[PDB]
Amino acid sequence: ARSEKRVPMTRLRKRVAERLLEAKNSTAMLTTFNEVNMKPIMDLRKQYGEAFEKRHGIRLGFMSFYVKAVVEALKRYPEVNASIDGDDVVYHNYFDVSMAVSTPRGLVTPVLRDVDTLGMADIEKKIKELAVKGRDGKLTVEDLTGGNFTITNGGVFGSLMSTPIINPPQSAILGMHAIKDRPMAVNGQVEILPMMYLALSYDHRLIDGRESVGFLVTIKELLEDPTRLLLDV
Amino acid sequence: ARSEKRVPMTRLRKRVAERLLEAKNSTAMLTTFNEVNMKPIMDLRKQYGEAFEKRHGIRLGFMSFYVKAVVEALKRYPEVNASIDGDDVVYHNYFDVSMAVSTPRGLVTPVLRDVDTLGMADIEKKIKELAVKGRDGKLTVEDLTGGNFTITNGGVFGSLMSTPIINPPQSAILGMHAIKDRPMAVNGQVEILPMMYLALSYDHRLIDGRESVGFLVTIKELLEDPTRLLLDV
Amino acid sequence: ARSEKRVPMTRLRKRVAERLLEAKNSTAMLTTFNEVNMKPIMDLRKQYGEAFEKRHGIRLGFMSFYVKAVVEALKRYPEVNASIDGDDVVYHNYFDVSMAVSTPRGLVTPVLRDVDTLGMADIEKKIKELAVKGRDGKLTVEDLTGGNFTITNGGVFGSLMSTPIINPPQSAILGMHAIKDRPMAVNGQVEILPMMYLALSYDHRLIDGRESVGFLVTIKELLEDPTRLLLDV
Amino acid sequence: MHAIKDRPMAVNGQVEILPMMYLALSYDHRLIDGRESVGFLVTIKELLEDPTRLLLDV
């Protein structure tokens, strides 16, 4: 009855475990949090969903909006788009974003490369290719060769809020969560809105509290009014 | 005036401090969070409190509901009911749950053993015995010989939300908090409900984001409708 | 196009990075959270702002209220006003509070010394001197010689909630955040209030969950009714 | 482009006063056909009434 069952870890399983622990102890990870109102994007999908699919051949999703917001944030705060290499701080000056996809054996993070020049239709198509290969277990090491910044999305599982973990040599990670209806204060009235928490884990020995808050405030602002991506405000 | 006072730490005090720090640095601890509506259980206590006491000789409390929810969650996600021993992942296949009780000199965690076969009346009686011995400082090392999972409750102190710390060799811990009235969105209306935050700290090198969120979603669901423990839904 | 830019870290920049990482790995940092209703203080500023300025020559701000609340909390929970020195726990028996100010090159934390004997007007004047020297980059090492407890304020940047980092040899830190309107449950009604989250990061190998929650509950209570500082309740 | 002037308009079965502007497109018919001229002017109308469509490319 009261008997255990032991399974030796594979050399792959142990190496992943060791790398995670070394990353944990080699970085001074801290986490900041915020909330974003998602109704403005849900309205856009509801209004232009069919026209977008008819013109481009792929559905308009939420992911394409997150990538554009992150790219603009990485332009305004370069220190988030950087990493430490020994004694040197390396500024990349280009925009590769890792994104987590679910394989049959857990989440893996392929890279969207040169995302600053893609359109929204291109991003959605590129994400679909990575998603299908990930589900098929067909991603190569080249696709997983890391970028500068990571987006992970725990909303599919129904998470409210959590602390994401950085993926070295990257210095920061953005965690998306479930969208849930909550009462909110709007111009002195109480209104129920679809709200989502944002979590940013960052390496404090490179990024300061000013930059982390400003980076996450920028993402909040661009998601609540995508027109600001056009105005650059 | 500006003078310090120094107290050498006892060898017991230092050993506890050292063990905590080693645990902190030997595990990749992360925390996920969620919220649970507690009114359904408060109604059950209000309706069946006297009948339960008259039949069983002990009052119906909240703790007996948390233990049953945790046991069902540990069945659905075995990876939370496991620990790492060197190169091996050990699956226990039995259900021992540690629970924190307040001694005169801080919290201590005796073990509820084989909680899957006990009824709610038995759990409440077993918790009362541990509580009285803990207050009396009369627990033996056998009672503190650890289990597989820990429940800690900071609600008595009035905490809103916090990050609990794992107790090795265990891999996860559940933190309960204070129950506080908050406005909530229910079917498009705003309703004030007694709400509690849940916090789960887990060792990421063993448990993944899917399992941690699913584990905490399961507990939320079972506490908001205990009848689901009967249906197994 | 896809070309990096490398900047060697100055010996000052590396030393700060190393000290932060050593602090991270040498302490068992945990964080508790709470929320405070700020309207009672905003009313006091609105009512007595002009009279206070006319009598004392300086404006009544929020910072003077936070310092008084912290000092009273440090009296009720001495274990927060302490640090570990090798094998000894050192109780300071005096009240020096570090406070973060923004320089042109990031936040720095000068010390308010013997804050228990100052009045609110004195605290505001002392904070203004440190603020001007910090903006001028004119603080000496004597001003930065650390105290017993730190207050950091991320509200100016617009942060909702975050995890602050301890500054050794200190054992705890208090993080203030942005004040934001939220609907709240008050005597069965829904009322929009200006609310702020509080975050306390503490060294668990010295401070226990009881003390951390009690310390943060005390601050919440004193800020929601400053008259309790007079009654000592 | 012309002056912006308030006019009553039909919006989802209601009458609402809106700031409206007329657009005029003069085109060389021996190169451009009626399809292109109308489509060109319809596109401008759509992008001005919701600039977010410049981001979506719809």
Residue numbers in the entry:
A (entry chain V), B (entry chain H), C (entry chain A): 172 to 404
D (entry chain D): 347 to 404
Paper text:
During the assembly and purification of a novel two-component protein nanoparticle with designed octahedral symmetry (to be detailed in an upcoming publication), we discovered that a significant portion of the purified sample consisted of a smaller, unidentified protein complex, which also exhibited octahedral symmetry, as revealed by ns-EM. However, the predominant species observed by ns-EM was a smaller, cube-like particle lacking the distinctive spiked features of our intended design. To identify the unknown nanoparticle in the absence of a corresponding amino acid sequence or prior structural information, we turned to the automated model-building software ModelAngelo. Running ModelAngelo in this manner on our 2.51 Å Cryo-EM map generated 92 all-atom sequence fragments of varying lengths, along with secondary structure predictions that were in strong agreement with the density of the unknown nanoparticle. Following the Protein BLAST result, a pairwise sequence alignment using EMBOSS Needle between the Uniprot sequence A0A140NDX4 of DLST from E. coli BL21 (DE3) and the ModelAngelo-derived consensus sequence was performed. This pairwise sequence alignment excluded the first 170 residues of DLST that were unresolved in our Cryo-EM map. Similarly, AlphaFold 3 (AF3) predictions using the catalytic domain of the A0A140NDX4 UniProt sequence also showed high agreement with our Cryo-EM map (UniProt, (n.d.), Abramson et al., 2024). To generate our final DLST catalytic domain model, the DLST sequence derived from E. coli BL21(DE3) was used as the input for another round of automated model building, this time utilizing the sequence-guided feature in ModelAngelo with the UniProt sequence for DLST (UniProt, (n.d.)). 100 mM glycine and 100 mM arginine were added to all purification buffers to mitigate potential off-target interactions between our nanoparticle and DLST, which resulted in the near-complete removal of DLST in all ns-EM micrographs of these purified samples.
DLST is an octahedral subunit of the E2 component of the ɑ-ketoglutarate dehydrogenase complex (KGDHC), which plays a pivotal role in the tricarboxylic acid (TCA) cycle, converting ɑ-ketoglutarate to succinyl-Coenzyme A and reducing nicotinamide adenine dinucleotide. The complex has three structured domains linked together by a chain of unstructured residues, with the C-terminal domain being the catalytic domain where multiple DLST subunits interact to form the full 24-subunit assembly. Notably, DLST has previously been observed as a contaminant protein in samples purified from E. coli expression systems (Bolanos-Garcia and Davies, 1760 (2006), Andi et al., 2019).
